[PDB]
Amino acid sequence: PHRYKPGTVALREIRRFQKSTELLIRKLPF
DNA sequence: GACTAGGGAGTAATCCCCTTGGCGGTTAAAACGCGGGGGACAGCGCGTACGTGCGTTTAAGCGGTGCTAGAGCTGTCTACGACCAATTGAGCGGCCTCGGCACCGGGATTCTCCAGGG
C-alpha cells in the first residue's frame, strides 16, 4: 500500500500551491 | 410647348447569416465513506523565578529666580505664475508578423518507506 503518513504529502502539496498563482475559486459558483 | 428617354431612390422580394430555447453525451471536479494512526490533551511534579514584606538611599516635584535667543506680526517689493493660440512633433489608434511562451515527453536525479537483520 502506497499510503504515506498524514502530512507527508501535505508539505509537497503546499509547495505546489505556493508555487502556483492561478485562480483557486471556480468562476461559476463565485 | 408636348411628349421621350434614362437612372438612382422608393418599394419590395431573396438571401441568409445569426441566434433564442431545449436535450443528449462525456469528461472532470466535487461528494462521500473507511482503517488507522498521529496530534490533542489530561494528570502530575517540580524548581526556580518571580510575588511579596521591609531597610536605605538618589531623584522628580517642589518653590523660586534671572535673564536670553528664538518665534509672531508689521511694511515692502519684485520675481514669477495664471491669463489667449500657432505650432508641430511626441504619441497614440489600427494592423502584421515570427518569436517566446505553453506545455508535455525521456531521462537523469532525487526524496521517501520498509522489513528485516546488524
Side-chain angles (χ1 to χ4, degrees), chain A residues 3-7 9-10 12-21 23:
Chain A
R3 278 177 47 123
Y4 300 145
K5 272 96 54 194
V9 84
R12 328 218 293 277
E13 166 40 29
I14 291 193
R15 261 89 55 95
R16 155 62 51 101
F17 273 136
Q18 84 196 317
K19 155 43 181 73
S20 270
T21 173
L23 278 188

